[PDB]
PDB file of C-alpha atoms and ligand atoms in Angstrom:
ATOM      1  CA  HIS V 243       7.176-162.117   0.304  1.00 48.85           C
ATOM      2  CA  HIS V 244       8.760-162.446  -3.326  1.00 47.61           C
ATOM      3  CA  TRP V 245       9.128-159.687  -5.628  1.00 47.83           C
ATOM      4  CA  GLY V 246       6.622-158.473  -7.921  1.00 47.48           C
ATOM      5  CA  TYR V 247       4.851-155.067  -9.116  1.00 46.45           C
ATOM      6  CA  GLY V 248       2.313-154.762  -6.432  1.00 47.15           C
ATOM      7  CA  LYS V 249       1.965-152.328  -3.664  1.00 47.14           C
ATOM      8  CA  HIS V 250       3.713-154.442  -1.157  1.00 49.01           C
ATOM      9  CA  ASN V 251       6.563-156.148  -3.557  1.00 51.73           C
ATOM     10  CA  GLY V 252       7.065-153.610  -6.274  1.00 52.75           C
ATOM     11  CA  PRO V 253      10.026-151.698  -7.522  1.00 51.56           C
ATOM     12  CA  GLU V 254      10.180-149.483  -4.415  1.00 49.86           C
ATOM     13  CA  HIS V 255      10.915-152.745  -2.190  1.00 44.07           C
ATOM     14  CA  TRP V 256      13.491-154.788  -4.446  1.00 42.61           C
ATOM     15  CA  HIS V 257      16.334-152.950  -2.963  1.00 47.42           C
ATOM     16  CA  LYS V 258      15.682-154.978   0.459  1.00 49.83           C
ATOM     17  CA  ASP V 259      16.503-158.426  -1.169  1.00 46.56           C
ATOM     18  CA  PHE V 260      18.518-156.785  -4.221  1.00 46.43           C
ATOM     19  CA  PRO V 261      20.701-153.943  -2.584  1.00 45.34           C
ATOM     20  CA  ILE V 262      22.180-153.275  -6.111  1.00 44.87           C
ATOM     21  CA  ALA V 263      18.636-151.670  -6.839  1.00 43.41           C
ATOM     22  CA  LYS V 264      20.195-148.529  -5.643  1.00 46.10           C
ATOM     23  CA  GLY V 265      23.461-149.066  -7.730  1.00 45.73           C
ATOM     24  CA  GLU V 266      25.257-146.984  -9.978  1.00 46.11           C
ATOM     25  CA  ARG V 267      24.418-148.450 -13.248  1.00 42.29           C
ATOM     26  CA  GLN V 268      20.739-149.174 -12.968  1.00 41.98           C
ATOM     27  CA  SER V 269      17.863-149.513 -15.572  1.00 42.24           C
ATOM     28  CA  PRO V 270      15.991-148.463 -17.175  1.00 42.15           C
ATOM     29  CA  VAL V 271      16.569-144.688 -17.518  1.00 39.44           C
ATOM     30  CA  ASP V 272      14.880-141.532 -19.080  1.00 40.59           C
ATOM     31  CA  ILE V 273      16.649-140.739 -22.396  1.00 41.40           C
ATOM     32  CA  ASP V 274      17.019-136.893 -22.362  1.00 39.41           C
ATOM     33  CA  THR V 275      17.232-136.405 -26.189  1.00 35.73           C
ATOM     34  CA  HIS V 276      18.890-133.046 -25.965  1.00 35.06           C
ATOM     35  CA  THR V 277      21.630-134.204 -23.614  1.00 35.49           C
ATOM     36  CA  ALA V 278      22.435-137.348 -25.581  1.00 32.64           C
ATOM     37  CA  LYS V 279      25.542-136.957 -27.633  1.00 34.55           C
ATOM     38  CA  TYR V 280      26.172-138.113 -31.472  1.00 39.72           C
ATOM     39  CA  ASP V 281      29.063-140.278 -31.130  1.00 38.39           C
ATOM     40  CA  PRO V 282      30.492-141.048 -34.596  1.00 37.73           C
ATOM     41  CA  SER V 283      32.894-143.745 -33.392  1.00 38.83           C
ATOM     42  CA  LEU V 284      29.805-145.699 -33.088  1.00 42.61           C
ATOM     43  CA  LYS V 285      30.026-148.696 -35.748  1.00 43.27           C
ATOM     44  CA  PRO V 286      26.963-149.812 -37.596  1.00 43.37           C
ATOM     45  CA  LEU V 287      24.602-152.011 -35.713  1.00 38.63           C
ATOM     46  CA  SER V 288      24.435-155.511 -37.027  1.00 35.87           C
ATOM     47  CA  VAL V 289      21.099-157.616 -36.454  1.00 36.19           C
ATOM     48  CA  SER V 290      21.383-160.991 -38.116  1.00 34.68           C
ATOM     49  CA  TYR V 291      18.372-163.071 -37.261  1.00 37.52           C
ATOM     50  CA  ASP V 292      17.894-165.024 -40.599  1.00 40.62           C
ATOM     51  CA  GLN V 293      18.584-168.286 -38.684  1.00 40.91           C
ATOM     52  CA  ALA V 294      17.037-167.697 -35.532  1.00 40.69           C
ATOM     53  CA  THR V 295      15.270-170.565 -34.209  1.00 43.48           C
ATOM     54  CA  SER V 296      12.395-170.252 -31.718  1.00 41.13           C
ATOM     55  CA  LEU V 297      11.768-172.979 -29.359  1.00 40.82           C
ATOM     56  CA  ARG V 298       9.148-172.295 -26.765  1.00 42.43           C
ATOM     57  CA  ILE V 299       7.065-169.343 -25.047  1.00 43.02           C
ATOM     58  CA  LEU V 300       6.846-169.123 -21.220  1.00 42.65           C
ATOM     59  CA  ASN V 301       4.840-167.218 -18.826  1.00 40.91           C
ATOM     60  CA  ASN V 302       7.336-166.829 -15.845  1.00 42.25           C
ATOM     61  CA  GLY V 303       4.964-164.753 -13.707  1.00 45.69           C
ATOM     62  CA  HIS V 304       6.525-161.580 -14.383  1.00 47.13           C
ATOM     63  CA  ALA V 305       6.134-161.222 -18.564  1.00 48.72           C
ATOM     64  CA  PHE V 306       6.131-163.948 -21.196  1.00 48.15           C
ATOM     65  CA  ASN V 307       9.384-165.032 -22.935  1.00 49.57           C
ATOM     66  CA  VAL V 308       9.732-166.385 -26.360  1.00 50.75           C
ATOM     67  CA  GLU V 309      13.038-168.562 -26.249  1.00 51.04           C
ATOM     68  CA  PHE V 310      15.612-169.452 -28.824  1.00 46.81           C
ATOM     69  CA  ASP V 311      17.873-172.367 -29.355  1.00 48.03           C
ATOM     70  CA  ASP V 312      21.073-170.556 -28.563  1.00 49.52           C
ATOM     71  CA  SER V 313      23.536-173.753 -28.692  1.00 51.08           C
ATOM     72  CA  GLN V 314      24.942-172.555 -32.172  1.00 52.47           C
ATOM     73  CA  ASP V 315      25.916-169.348 -33.588  1.00 55.08           C
ATOM     74  CA  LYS V 316      22.684-168.366 -35.513  1.00 57.11           C
ATOM     75  CA  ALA V 317      20.885-165.057 -34.433  1.00 52.81           C
ATOM     76  CA  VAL V 318      23.499-162.449 -33.332  1.00 53.31           C
ATOM     77  CA  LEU V 319      23.716-158.853 -32.490  1.00 56.04           C
ATOM     78  CA  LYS V 320      26.975-157.108 -33.284  1.00 56.34           C
ATOM     79  CA  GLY V 321      28.672-153.763 -34.123  1.00 56.11           C
ATOM     80  CA  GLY V 322      27.293-150.369 -32.741  1.00 54.26           C
ATOM     81  CA  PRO V 323      28.961-150.128 -29.166  1.00 54.02           C
ATOM     82  CA  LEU V 324      29.506-153.802 -28.792  1.00 54.88           C
ATOM     83  CA  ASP V 325      32.850-155.504 -29.121  1.00 54.30           C
ATOM     84  CA  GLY V 326      32.354-159.069 -30.175  1.00 51.56           C
ATOM     85  CA  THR V 327      29.394-161.094 -30.766  1.00 51.06           C
ATOM     86  CA  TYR V 328      26.120-161.503 -28.759  1.00 51.00           C
ATOM     87  CA  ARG V 329      23.809-164.318 -29.257  1.00 54.18           C
ATOM     88  CA  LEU V 330      19.754-163.988 -28.849  1.00 53.31           C
ATOM     89  CA  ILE V 331      18.488-166.293 -26.089  1.00 51.94           C
ATOM     90  CA  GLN V 332      14.689-164.688 -25.636  1.00 50.96           C
ATOM     91  CA  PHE V 333      12.547-161.749 -25.902  1.00 52.96           C
ATOM     92  CA  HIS V 334       9.782-160.543 -23.718  1.00 53.20           C
ATOM     93  CA  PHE V 335       7.866-157.175 -23.235  1.00 53.44           C
ATOM     94  CA  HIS V 336       6.703-155.009 -20.632  1.00 51.41           C
ATOM     95  CA  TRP V 337       3.291-153.203 -20.859  1.00 49.33           C
ATOM     96  CA  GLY V 338       0.836-151.020 -19.041  1.00 47.02           C
ATOM     97  CA  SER V 339      -2.980-151.373 -17.827  1.00 48.99           C
ATOM     98  CA  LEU V 340      -3.223-148.294 -19.892  1.00 47.11           C
ATOM     99  CA  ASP V 341      -1.979-147.011 -23.554  1.00 48.36           C
ATOM    100  CA  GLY V 342      -0.502-144.148 -21.751  1.00 47.47           C
ATOM    101  CA  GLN V 343       2.164-146.412 -19.757  1.00 47.67           C
ATOM    102  CA  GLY V 344       3.892-149.453 -20.144  1.00 49.47           C
ATOM    103  CA  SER V 345       7.345-148.776 -21.326  1.00 47.24           C
ATOM    104  CA  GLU V 346      10.490-149.168 -19.061  1.00 49.94           C
ATOM    105  CA  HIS V 347      12.755-146.419 -20.596  1.00 52.58           C
ATOM    106  CA  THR V 348      11.227-143.208 -21.385  1.00 50.37           C
ATOM    107  CA  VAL V 349      12.307-140.426 -23.947  1.00 49.24           C
ATOM    108  CA  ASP V 350      12.216-136.812 -22.588  1.00 51.77           C
ATOM    109  CA  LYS V 351       9.658-138.332 -19.868  1.00 52.86           C
ATOM    110  CA  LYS V 352       7.284-139.797 -22.588  1.00 53.24           C
ATOM    111  CA  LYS V 353       6.263-143.274 -21.604  1.00 52.86           C
ATOM    112  CA  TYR V 354       5.285-145.548 -24.621  1.00 52.07           C
ATOM    113  CA  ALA V 355       2.319-148.278 -24.317  1.00 53.47           C
ATOM    114  CA  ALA V 356       5.048-151.167 -24.046  1.00 50.95           C
ATOM    115  CA  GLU V 357       8.573-151.988 -24.801  1.00 48.93           C
ATOM    116  CA  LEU V 358       9.878-154.931 -26.267  1.00 45.64           C
ATOM    117  CA  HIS V 359      13.432-156.516 -25.015  1.00 41.38           C
ATOM    118  CA  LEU V 360      15.563-158.644 -27.062  1.00 39.42           C
ATOM    119  CA  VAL V 361      18.109-160.168 -24.708  1.00 40.62           C
ATOM    120  CA  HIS V 362      21.369-161.464 -26.106  1.00 41.47           C
ATOM    121  CA  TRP V 363      24.689-162.781 -24.412  1.00 43.53           C
ATOM    122  CA  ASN V 364      28.143-162.137 -24.980  1.00 39.21           C
ATOM    123  CA  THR V 365      29.723-165.486 -26.395  1.00 37.98           C
ATOM    124  CA  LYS V 366      33.053-165.196 -25.203  1.00 41.66           C
ATOM    125  CA  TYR V 367      31.460-166.042 -21.742  1.00 44.59           C
ATOM    126  CA  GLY V 368      30.229-169.471 -23.032  1.00 43.14           C
ATOM    127  CA  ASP V 369      26.726-169.390 -21.626  1.00 40.87           C
ATOM    128  CA  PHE V 370      23.966-167.085 -20.388  1.00 40.10           C
ATOM    129  CA  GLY V 371      24.809-168.220 -16.629  1.00 44.07           C
ATOM    130  CA  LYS V 372      28.423-166.859 -16.813  1.00 42.43           C
ATOM    131  CA  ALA V 373      27.722-163.899 -19.037  1.00 44.89           C
ATOM    132  CA  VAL V 374      25.333-162.183 -16.367  1.00 42.82           C
ATOM    133  CA  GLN V 375      28.187-162.181 -14.122  1.00 42.37           C
ATOM    134  CA  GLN V 376      30.169-159.859 -16.295  1.00 42.41           C
ATOM    135  CA  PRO V 377      29.878-156.069 -16.573  1.00 37.91           C
ATOM    136  CA  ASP V 378      29.779-156.700 -20.740  1.00 39.21           C
ATOM    137  CA  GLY V 379      27.741-160.009 -20.316  1.00 37.53           C
ATOM    138  CA  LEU V 380      24.455-159.058 -21.994  1.00 34.06           C
ATOM    139  CA  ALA V 381      23.331-156.674 -25.064  1.00 35.71           C
ATOM    140  CA  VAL V 382      19.640-155.727 -24.786  1.00 35.74           C
ATOM    141  CA  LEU V 383      17.826-154.186 -27.717  1.00 35.88           C
ATOM    142  CA  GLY V 384      14.786-152.212 -26.763  1.00 36.61           C
ATOM    143  CA  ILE V 385      11.917-151.358 -29.167  1.00 36.06           C
ATOM    144  CA  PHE V 386       9.131-149.161 -27.953  1.00 37.38           C
ATOM    145  CA  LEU V 387       5.536-149.884 -28.912  1.00 35.25           C
ATOM    146  CA  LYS V 388       2.812-147.397 -29.778  1.00 34.91           C
ATOM    147  CA  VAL V 389      -0.933-148.087 -30.256  1.00 35.07           C
ATOM    148  CA  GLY V 390      -2.051-147.587 -33.692  1.00 33.57           C
ATOM    149  CA  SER V 391      -1.826-149.882 -36.811  1.00 34.18           C
ATOM    150  CA  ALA V 392      -1.360-153.683 -36.079  1.00 32.11           C
ATOM    151  CA  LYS V 393       2.175-155.398 -36.299  1.00 32.78           C
ATOM    152  CA  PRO V 394       1.477-158.287 -38.358  1.00 32.39           C
ATOM    153  CA  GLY V 395       4.661-160.150 -37.293  1.00 33.13           C
ATOM    154  CA  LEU V 396       3.388-159.850 -33.703  1.00 33.01           C
ATOM    155  CA  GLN V 397       0.254-161.707 -34.104  1.00 34.29           C
ATOM    156  CA  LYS V 398       1.544-165.260 -34.019  1.00 32.20           C
ATOM    157  CA  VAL V 399       2.522-164.337 -30.337  1.00 30.13           C
ATOM    158  CA  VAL V 400      -0.612-162.716 -29.624  1.00 28.33           C
ATOM    159  CA  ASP V 401      -2.407-165.844 -30.580  1.00 26.81           C
ATOM    160  CA  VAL V 402      -0.698-168.203 -28.493  1.00 25.55           C
ATOM    161  CA  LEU V 403      -1.092-166.253 -25.330  1.00 25.47           C
ATOM    162  CA  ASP V 404      -4.365-168.222 -24.451  1.00 24.68           C
ATOM    163  CA  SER V 405      -2.575-171.173 -24.077  1.00 24.21           C
ATOM    164  CA  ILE V 406      -0.140-169.755 -21.415  1.00 25.42           C
ATOM    165  CA  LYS V 407      -2.326-167.507 -19.439  1.00 24.83           C
ATOM    166  CA  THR V 408      -1.029-168.336 -16.256  1.00 23.66           C
ATOM    167  CA  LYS V 409       2.479-168.424 -14.129  1.00 24.46           C
ATOM    168  CA  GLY V 410       4.386-171.453 -15.069  1.00 28.61           C
ATOM    169  CA  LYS V 411       2.624-172.588 -18.253  1.00 32.06           C
ATOM    170  CA  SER V 412       4.558-173.085 -21.545  1.00 26.39           C
ATOM    171  CA  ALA V 413       3.916-173.874 -25.007  1.00 21.11           C
ATOM    172  CA  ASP V 414       5.796-174.976 -28.128  1.00 21.34           C
ATOM    173  CA  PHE V 415       6.678-172.015 -30.416  1.00 23.60           C
ATOM    174  CA  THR V 416       8.832-172.885 -33.257  1.00 23.38           C
ATOM    175  CA  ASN V 417       9.988-171.069 -36.343  1.00 28.13           C
ATOM    176  CA  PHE V 418       8.958-167.620 -35.150  1.00 29.49           C
ATOM    177  CA  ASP V 419      10.738-164.876 -37.089  1.00 27.80           C
ATOM    178  CA  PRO V 420      11.811-161.825 -34.732  1.00 27.30           C
ATOM    179  CA  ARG V 421      12.597-159.843 -38.016  1.00 21.95           C
ATOM    180  CA  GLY V 422       8.923-159.225 -38.127  1.00 19.59           C
ATOM    181  CA  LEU V 423       9.245-157.079 -34.943  1.00 19.05           C
ATOM    182  CA  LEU V 424      11.845-154.672 -36.121  1.00 18.10           C
ATOM    183  CA  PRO V 425      11.049-150.994 -37.187  1.00 18.52           C
ATOM    184  CA  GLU V 426      12.456-149.456 -40.386  1.00 19.07           C
ATOM    185  CA  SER V 427      15.376-147.691 -38.883  1.00 16.01           C
ATOM    186  CA  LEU V 428      18.003-148.909 -36.413  1.00 17.36           C
ATOM    187  CA  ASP V 429      18.955-145.425 -35.223  1.00 17.54           C
ATOM    188  CA  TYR V 430      19.531-145.961 -31.514  1.00 13.13           C
ATOM    189  CA  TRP V 431      20.833-144.656 -28.172  1.00 11.08           C
ATOM    190  CA  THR V 432      23.076-146.757 -25.951  1.00  9.82           C
ATOM    191  CA  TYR V 433      24.326-146.653 -22.156  1.00 12.41           C
ATOM    192  CA  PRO V 434      25.386-149.251 -19.752  1.00 14.87           C
ATOM    193  CA  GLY V 435      22.933-150.579 -17.395  1.00 15.82           C
ATOM    194  CA  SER V 436      21.211-153.266 -15.743  1.00 18.10           C
ATOM    195  CA  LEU V 437      18.505-156.089 -15.690  1.00 20.36           C
ATOM    196  CA  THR V 438      15.542-154.252 -15.005  1.00 16.03           C
ATOM    197  CA  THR V 439      14.173-157.011 -12.803  1.00 15.56           C
ATOM    198  CA  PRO V 440      15.619-158.872  -9.949  1.00 11.59           C
ATOM    199  CA  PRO V 441      18.488-159.912  -9.652  1.00 10.46           C
ATOM    200  CA  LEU V 442      19.234-156.283 -11.339  1.00 12.86           C
ATOM    201  CA  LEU V 443      22.653-157.421 -12.409  1.00 12.12           C
ATOM    202  CA  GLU V 444      24.693-154.556 -13.780  1.00 10.32           C
ATOM    203  CA  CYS V 445      25.706-156.501 -16.816  1.00 10.08           C
ATOM    204  CA  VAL V 446      23.743-154.947 -19.537  1.00  9.61           C
ATOM    205  CA  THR V 447      24.890-152.769 -22.721  1.00  8.57           C
ATOM    206  CA  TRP V 448      21.509-151.145 -23.448  1.00  8.87           C
ATOM    207  CA  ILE V 449      20.707-150.471 -26.998  1.00  8.87           C
ATOM    208  CA  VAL V 450      17.156-148.748 -27.363  1.00  9.08           C
ATOM    209  CA  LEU V 451      15.837-147.921 -30.711  1.00 10.73           C
ATOM    210  CA  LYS V 452      14.548-144.622 -31.616  1.00 10.54           C
ATOM    211  CA  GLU V 453      11.809-145.570 -34.236  1.00 10.54           C
ATOM    212  CA  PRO V 454       8.911-147.350 -32.220  1.00 12.44           C
ATOM    213  CA  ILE V 455       6.714-149.947 -33.849  1.00 11.09           C
ATOM    214  CA  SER V 456       2.906-149.716 -34.031  1.00  9.93           C
ATOM    215  CA  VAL V 457       0.779-152.384 -32.465  1.00 10.24           C
ATOM    216  CA  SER V 458      -3.103-152.373 -32.518  1.00  8.41           C
ATOM    217  CA  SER V 459      -5.173-151.787 -29.467  1.00  8.44           C
ATOM    218  CA  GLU V 460      -6.567-155.263 -30.176  1.00  8.14           C
ATOM    219  CA  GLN V 461      -3.135-156.822 -29.773  1.00  8.41           C
ATOM    220  CA  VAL V 462      -2.156-154.917 -26.595  1.00 10.67           C
ATOM    221  CA  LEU V 463      -5.502-155.574 -24.885  1.00 13.44           C
ATOM    222  CA  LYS V 464      -4.752-159.516 -25.534  1.00 14.22           C
ATOM    223  CA  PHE V 465      -1.377-158.979 -23.800  1.00 14.12           C
ATOM    224  CA  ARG V 466      -3.585-157.489 -20.719  1.00 11.26           C
ATOM    225  CA  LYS V 467      -5.578-160.639 -20.626  1.00 16.91           C
ATOM    226  CA  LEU V 468      -2.459-162.560 -19.063  1.00 16.33           C
ATOM    227  CA  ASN V 469      -2.179-163.348 -15.148  1.00 12.58           C
ATOM    228  CA  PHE V 470       0.577-163.029 -12.878  1.00 11.64           C
ATOM    229  CA  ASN V 471      -0.902-165.795 -10.707  1.00  8.79           C
ATOM    230  CA  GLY V 472      -0.645-169.452 -11.295  1.00  9.49           C
ATOM    231  CA  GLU V 473      -3.812-171.683 -12.180  1.00  8.04           C
ATOM    232  CA  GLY V 474      -5.851-172.225  -9.175  1.00  8.89           C
ATOM    233  CA  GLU V 475      -4.771-169.116  -7.714  1.00  6.38           C
ATOM    234  CA  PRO V 476      -6.819-165.817  -7.557  1.00  4.92           C
ATOM    235  CA  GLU V 477      -6.608-163.900 -10.948  1.00  2.00           C
ATOM    236  CA  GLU V 478      -4.416-161.079 -10.953  1.00  2.00           C
ATOM    237  CA  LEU V 479      -3.998-159.461 -14.357  1.00  2.00           C
ATOM    238  CA  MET V 480      -0.707-159.183 -15.664  1.00  2.00           C
ATOM    239  CA  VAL V 481      -0.410-155.503 -16.364  1.00  2.00           C
ATOM    240  CA  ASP V 482       2.179-152.736 -15.551  1.00  2.00           C
ATOM    241  CA  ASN V 483       5.020-155.138 -15.451  1.00  2.32           C
ATOM    242  CA  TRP V 484       7.531-152.219 -15.863  1.00  2.00           C
ATOM    243  CA  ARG V 485      10.278-150.794 -13.557  1.00  4.31           C
ATOM    244  CA  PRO V 486      10.316-146.851 -13.492  1.00  2.00           C
ATOM    245  CA  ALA V 487      13.372-144.698 -14.611  1.00  2.00           C
ATOM    246  CA  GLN V 488      16.298-144.951 -12.345  1.00  2.56           C
ATOM    247  CA  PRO V 489      18.891-142.117 -11.745  1.00  2.05           C
ATOM    248  CA  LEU V 490      21.321-141.695 -14.400  1.00  2.00           C
ATOM    249  CA  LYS V 491      24.211-140.950 -11.987  1.00  2.00           C
ATOM    250  CA  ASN V 492      27.656-141.095 -13.673  1.00  2.00           C
ATOM    251  CA  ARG V 493      26.525-142.024 -17.168  1.00  2.00           C
ATOM    252  CA  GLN V 494      26.213-140.718 -20.618  1.00  2.00           C
ATOM    253  CA  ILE V 495      23.779-141.880 -23.126  1.00  2.00           C
ATOM    254  CA  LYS V 496      25.247-141.755 -26.726  1.00  2.00           C
ATOM    255  CA  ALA V 497      23.456-141.553 -29.909  1.00  2.00           C
ATOM    256  CA  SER V 498      24.184-143.359 -33.122  1.00  2.00           C
ATOM    257  CA  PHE V 499      22.481-140.738 -35.275  1.00  2.00           C
ATOM    258  CA  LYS V 500      22.345-136.835 -35.540  1.00  2.00           C
TER     259      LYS V 500
HETATM  260  C1  WWV C2042      20.269-165.177 -12.731  1.00  2.00           C
HETATM  261  C2  WWV C2042      19.205-164.609 -13.696  1.00  2.00           C
HETATM  262  C3  WWV C2042      20.189-163.523 -14.543  1.00  2.00           C
HETATM  263  C4  WWV C2042      18.730-165.627 -14.791  1.00  2.00           C
HETATM  264  C5  WWV C2042      19.361-166.809 -14.771  1.00  2.00           C
HETATM  265  C6  WWV C2042      18.799-168.016 -15.673  1.00  2.00           C
HETATM  266  C7  WWV C2042      17.502-167.909 -16.484  1.00  2.00           C
HETATM  267  C8  WWV C2042      17.014-166.694 -16.222  1.00  2.00           C
HETATM  268  C9  WWV C2042      17.527-165.653 -15.417  1.00  2.00           C
HETATM  269  N1  WWV C2042      16.923-164.535 -15.371  1.00  2.00           N
HETATM  270  C10 WWV C2042      16.929-163.565 -16.242  1.00  2.00           C
HETATM  271  O1  WWV C2042      17.055-163.834 -17.356  1.00  2.00           O
HETATM  272  N2  WWV C2042      16.307-162.463 -15.855  1.00  2.00           N
HETATM  273  C11 WWV C2042      16.134-161.149 -16.849  1.00  2.00           C
HETATM  274  C12 WWV C2042      16.459-161.045 -18.299  1.00  2.00           C
HETATM  275  C13 WWV C2042      16.249-159.946 -18.743  1.00  2.00           C
HETATM  276  C14 WWV C2042      15.754-158.552 -18.183  1.00  2.00           C
HETATM  277  S1  WWV C2042      15.623-157.080 -19.209  1.00  2.00           S
HETATM  278  N3  WWV C2042      14.071-156.500 -18.724  1.00  2.00           N
HETATM  279  O2  WWV C2042      16.310-156.289 -18.572  1.00  2.00           O
HETATM  280  O3  WWV C2042      15.752-157.500 -20.492  1.00  2.00           O
HETATM  281  C15 WWV C2042      15.419-158.832 -16.818  1.00  2.00           C
HETATM  282  C16 WWV C2042      15.609-159.972 -16.024  1.00  2.00           C
HETATM  283 ZN1   ZN C2043      12.805-156.499 -19.961  1.00  2.00          ZN
END
């Protein structure tokens, strides 16, 4: 039927509806830390979220998105590998049914418990819908999660999940500050890739931070209480909503650090 993460509609099936699944710049990928090369030409990364304005949180049946008002020039990502300015539109996570899996990118084949994606669009293309049609349309900032100490800045997200348990439910979610989800270091790897779910468009500059954030077991357990299904349908837990690593093909991963 329609795509998902199950046996009959998961990642190995996506290529039938979305042939670009077998394309030349698909994501995620395994980051081989020894083959990644330091690029002194990379300019410093600039994350300016002081004026970010969150509006709403939505369970879309695949993950949950915290959405931002992107009608003004507020929360922007620039520098690093990027030319120009990219505006924050939403963030979401991918996670596992177990602490030992959940991330989409891997690091020397290591899977983290989850992965946060902060999605930004290139303002030269006017809006998100036009930007995703361009090879440099999006920049996604990826941040690994490991299970250990709690992330206090995540808790406001965790506590609203009960109100969006099932597909299609949304809730007001204003004044959430995504700066509370960032690690200390902005050291990163970068490569050209794609959306990691259908339609799998090859429009993303990936920027994946080397330093993970820690969240508590209790925090990620609450992610795993969400549902893929809609209300009044059979309960299917929203877990393992990650795509495995795709072939690197003719790409090089660059590091911002040595
Ligand atoms: C046509 C698609 C791109 C579209 C138009 C309007 C609203 C939402 C969407 N879909 C998405 O935004 N999908 C989407 C966004 C981000 C990602 S990810 N996991 O690579 O960061 C994967 C899928
Ligand atoms: Zn994602």
